[PDB]
């Protein structure tokens, strides 16, 4: 559980640079918000160590929440006077995505290369595809830490992405 320490070291280091150089206020808000969420991760996941996969899921949860908020603001309008609340959510996703890609894990492209053969087999060995559950049963959800170098959430979302493409109906 040292990569998490290395990954968290950069996040705190960037905050000092942001404050010292008077960098983007939004980036300061992003980093300070991640450390708040990371504080919960320390408390909740105590005695279970802190691997990068739980950090990846922590950052992934933040990204989707802001995307969900942005998807509503860009449709119904922003509440602030300058109508910048919707765009602020998108700009904060870029900062978190920057730290998300810095983690020592495999990208979605590699996982898509390691999941599509499973997805294709299910369609070929059953004729038709109706749910991602039939794909989940053939996924080894115990050895995806160094072979695929992916997390539980990373694999779960990737299978949904391929299932929507490969769904017959």
């Amino acid at each position: 559980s040292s990569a998490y320490d290395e990954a968290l070291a950069t996040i705190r280091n960037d905050l000092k640079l942001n404050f010292r150089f008077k960098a983007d206020v939004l980036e300061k808000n992003v980093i300070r918000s991640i450390l708040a969420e990371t504080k919960n991760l320390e408390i909740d996941n105590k005695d279970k160590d802190l691997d990068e996969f739980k950090l990846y899921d922590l950052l992934s949860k933040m990204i989707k929440q802001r995307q969900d908020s942005a998807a509503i603001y860009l449709k119904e309008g922003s509440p602030d006077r300058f109508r910048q609340t919707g765009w602020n959510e998108l700009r904060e996703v870029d900062y978190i995505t920057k730290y998300l890609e810095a983690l020592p894990v495999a990208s979605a492209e590699e996982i898509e290369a390691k999941v599509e053969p499973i997805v294709q087999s299910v369609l070929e060995e059953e004729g038709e595809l109706k749910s991602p559950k039939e794909i989940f049963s053939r996924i080894p959800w115990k050895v995806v830490n160094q072979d695929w170098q992916a997390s539980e959430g990373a694999v779960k979302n990737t299978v949904l992405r391929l299932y929507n493409l490969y769904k017959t109906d």
């Binding site: 898509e112 599509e116 294709q120 369609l123 070929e124 391929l162 493409l165 490969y166 769904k167």
Partner: peptide, 28 residues
């Protein structure tokens, strides 16, 4: 029995275009 013609790719990723197994409609 039947087999696909040559130069038919096994995989493709054209964005969000649906991905279906290549089928020769002549053999239906």
């Amino acid at each position: 029995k039947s087999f696909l013609p040559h130069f038919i790719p096994k995989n493709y990723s054209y964005g969000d275009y649906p991905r279906l197994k290549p089928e020769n409609l002549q053999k239906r």
